[PDB]
Amino acid sequence: MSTDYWLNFTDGGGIVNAVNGSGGNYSVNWSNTGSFVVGKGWTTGSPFRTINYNAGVWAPNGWGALALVGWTRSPLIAYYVVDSWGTARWTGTYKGTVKSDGGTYDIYTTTRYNAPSIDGDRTTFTQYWSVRQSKRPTGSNATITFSNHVNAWKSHGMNLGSNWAYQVMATAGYQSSGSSNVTVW
Ligand SMILES: [K+]
Numbered sequence: 001m002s003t004d005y006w007l008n009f010t011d012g013g014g015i016v017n018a019v020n021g022s023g024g025n026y027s028v029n030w031s032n033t034g035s036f037v038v039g040k041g042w043t044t045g046s047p048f049r050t051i052n053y054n055a056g057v058w059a060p061n062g063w064g065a066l067a068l069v070g071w072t073r074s075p076l077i078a079y080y081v082v083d084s085w086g087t088a089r090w091t092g093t094y095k096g097t098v099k100s101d102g103g104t105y106d107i108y109t110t111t112r113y114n115a116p117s118i119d120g121d122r123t124t125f126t127q128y129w130s131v132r133q134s135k136r137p138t139g140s141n142a143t144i145t146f147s148n149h150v151n152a153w154k155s156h157g158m159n160l161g162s163n164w165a166y167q168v169m170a171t172a173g174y175q176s177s178g179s180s181n182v183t184v185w
Pocket of ligand 1: 020021022023
């Protein structure tokens with residue numbers, strides 16, 4: 001279905017001027033921030049959804065990421081499919097690769113401790129990552145066939161929970177500046 005969810009989260013640092021645009025469109029102007037995640041998407045994620053997006057502007061300056069971001073409960077797990085970024089070194093436990101939507105992604109797993117989640121301000125949870133091996137071109141219609149990622153993660157025993165929460169094509173960052181404009185459908 002078309003989008004029905006607006007995510008606008010910041011830890012409070014600097015400027016995160018997030019604009020809830022028409023329909024699935026949004027934009028973000030950010031500068032000297034802390035952590036933040038912003039985007040349009042769906043209230044209930046699905047492992048079978050094909051996410052469409054067009055990033056008309058993608059201009060991160062620092063640690064910023066253009067990524068599908070979502071959650072399950074039962075158990076509580078955060079997941080990320082990163083298509084582009086500014087300056088970022090991907091590091092940590094490495095599980096393999098998945099090919100999807102004309103690209104190849106590296107699979108990582110991490111843990112966050114005493115951090116914000118959909119369940120509270122100080123929670124501990126596993127994170128599943130797909131990170132594109134090269135930055136995806138932007139400005140044209142793009143697809144994330146999320147089922148390919150779910151299935152690849154499953155093949156490494158990285159199972160998602162049964163109670164699906166939000167699923168957003170996000171702009172996220174950490175102590176950085178930039179601008180983005182993304183339409184999601
Ligand atoms: K709006």
